[PDB]
Amino acid sequence: GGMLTLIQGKKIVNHLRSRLAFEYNGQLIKILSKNIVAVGSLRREEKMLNDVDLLIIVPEKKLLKHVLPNIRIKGLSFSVKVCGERKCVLFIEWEKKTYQLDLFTALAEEKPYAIFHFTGPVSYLIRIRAALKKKNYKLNQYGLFKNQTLVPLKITTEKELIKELGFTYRIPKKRL
Amino acid sequence: GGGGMLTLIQGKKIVNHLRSRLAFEYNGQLIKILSKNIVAVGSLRREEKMLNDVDLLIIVPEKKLLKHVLPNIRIKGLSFSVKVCGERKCVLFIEWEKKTYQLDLFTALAEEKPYAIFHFTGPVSYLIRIRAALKKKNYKLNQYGLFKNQTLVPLKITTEKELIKELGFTYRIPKKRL
DNA sequence: CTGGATCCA
DNA sequence: CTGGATCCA
DNA sequence: CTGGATCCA
DNA sequence: CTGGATCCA
Ligand SMILES: Nc1nc2c(ncn2[C@H]2C[C@H](O)[C@@H](CO[P@](=O)([SeH])OP(=O)(O)OP(=O)(O)O)O2)c(=O)[nH]1
Ligand SMILES: Nc1nc2c(ncn2[C@H]2C[C@H](O)[C@@H](CO[P@](=O)([SeH])OP(=O)(O)OP(=O)(O)O)O2)c(=O)[nH]1
Ligand SMILES: [Mn+2]
Ligand SMILES: [Mn+2]
């Protein structure tokens, strides 16, 4: 995995938006643009990137075993380092260089929690999570939990989630 | 794979050799591990004819020692290299009588002993049936204890035999478990 | 069935 | 802070 | 490698 | 309707 600039990251994401699909029992299902979310240091607009992180929103639980393991990227040369249902790491060829692409999956119901988790940075996530831990809550990429039971927040966006958790909303680049 | 297959008796002779030769460094103090706190487990305890490795469970008196026992293990006089080594699992490739074998070391705390022995004895298929049955009654059995809702259920038991009976199963000697 | 060592995310 | 993939145990 | 019950095309 | 997939303790 080589080092990328922000500008290169954005250009790679633009190329992938239209070209991600997966094979579901011998049928090629296209992944929709609205279900593809740039996360990690790219969403945070860091000028240096070690990789490109994309979150894929999966409409149904039964598709989890198919999406990342049978991933297709039309016309692009890549090799797969590790791949399960929730994280898949590809090495993509881009013009005499090799870049690390990380793909992650969230179910529709996990969406804002996954976006929050994968946006980071880690330092920010630790503060937030410790603050909720003190109130006996547990936050991860799948939900908010109290006593190992899911807390039913009824929210769509990452912004709604953050307000509902009782924290000051900050744009991805201003989180630290 | 790491090591060659051994006969049962080869495995036992290796265990007999190692019983009086395991030690660890506790801040430069070299402490011998007691034979009483070493239990042969895995296919050796089940008395299978051929073994793919040797599994030993080391019983550790106190929690503070877990960061020292396996990470600073010593087998004086024996030639070996390390595959992986943490506090709960250390795997070694040992030289015994001019062939290379895999030696698995595991640690259990004193309170965990009967659960650990049960875990590491196997066989795997047997353990899965036992655990599935307890899972259906909302328990979780592992090498550290029996749990109900991520909370330790303190059984008044000491040995593996007592544990297997208290869990509501028919006790079978290691070699009869399938 | 359940979890460890490693190296990430 | 909290969890995933790999290859085991 | 739960394994019988229950769901759903 | 029933059989393969998924549920659940
Ligand atoms: N809770 C938690 N989340 C973590 C962690 N590491 C990465 N993540 C999540 C948040 C990160 O923004 C995202 C991608 O991680 P990674 O690629 Se290692 O770092 P990222 O912030 O993108 O910067 P870069 O890729 O190093 O440029 O995954 C972590 O340790 N704990
Ligand atoms: N719960 C559970 N326990 C497992 C598992 N694999 C190994 N173990 C435990 C039980 C085994 O008897 C023990 C040693 O494993 P391993 O060395 Se892979 O098999 P073992 O029975 O010694 O046969 P051999 O080493 O192949 O001769 O560790 C497992 O999948 N689940
Ligand atoms: Mn990244
Ligand atoms: Mn073994």
Author numbering:
A (entry chain A): -1 to 174
B (entry chain B): -3 to 174
The article reads:
To provide a molecular basis for designing better drugs targeting polymerases, African swine fever virus DNA Polymerase X (Pol X) was used as a model for the study. As the simplest DNA polymerase identified to date, Pol X belongs to the polymerase X family and is constituted of 174 amino acids. In this chemical reaction, metal-ion A (MeA) is a catalytic ion and decreases the pKa of 3′-OH, facilitating its attack on the α-phosphate of the incoming dNTP, and metal-ion B (MeB) stabilizes the dNTP-DNA-polymerase complex and increases the electrophilicity of the phosphorus center. To clearly understand the phosphodiester-bond-formation mechanism and the metal-ion catalysis of polymerases, we designed modified dNTP substrates with a chiral α-phosphorus center (α-P center) using a single selenium atom, without affecting the overall and local structures, to explore the absolute configuration inversion and probe the mechanisms of the metal ion–oxygen interactions.
DNApre, generated on the DNA-I by incorporating ddNTP without 3′-OH, failed to attack the incoming dNTP (dGTP, dGTPαSe-I, or dGTPαSe-II), thereby forming the substrate complex (the substrate–primer-template–polymerase complex: nat-dG_sub, dGSe-I_sub, or dGSe-II_sub), resulting in the before-reaction state (without the bond formation) retaining the absolute configuration of dGTPαSe. In crystallization trials, DNApre-I (generated form 5′-CAGGATCCT-3′ with ddTTP, without 3′-OH) and DNApre-II (generated form 5′-CTGGATCCA-3′ with ddATP, without 3′-OH) could not be extended by attacking dGTP or dGTPαSe diastereomers in the crystallization conditions, which allowed the dNTPs to just bind and retain their absolute configuration. Firstly, dGTPαSe diastereomers were synthesized and separated by reversed-phase-HPLC as peak 1 (dGTPαSe-I, eluted first on HPLC) and peak 2 (dGTPαSe-II, eluted later), and their absolute configurations on the α-P center were determined as Rp and Sp, respectively, by X-ray crystallography. The nat-dG_sub and dGSe-II_sub structures were refined at similar resolutions, 2.25 and 2.29 Å, respectively. However, when comparing the substrate structures containing native dGTP and dGTPαSe-II, we only found a strong Se-density difference in the electron map, which indicated the Sp configuration on the Se-modified α-P center, determining the absolute configuration of dGTPαSe-II (Sp diastereomer). As expected, all structures of the three substrate complexes captured the reaction state at the pre-polymerization level, and they belonged to the P212121 space group. Superposition showed that the three overall structures were very similar, and their root-mean-square deviations (RMSD) were approximately 0.7–1.3 Å.
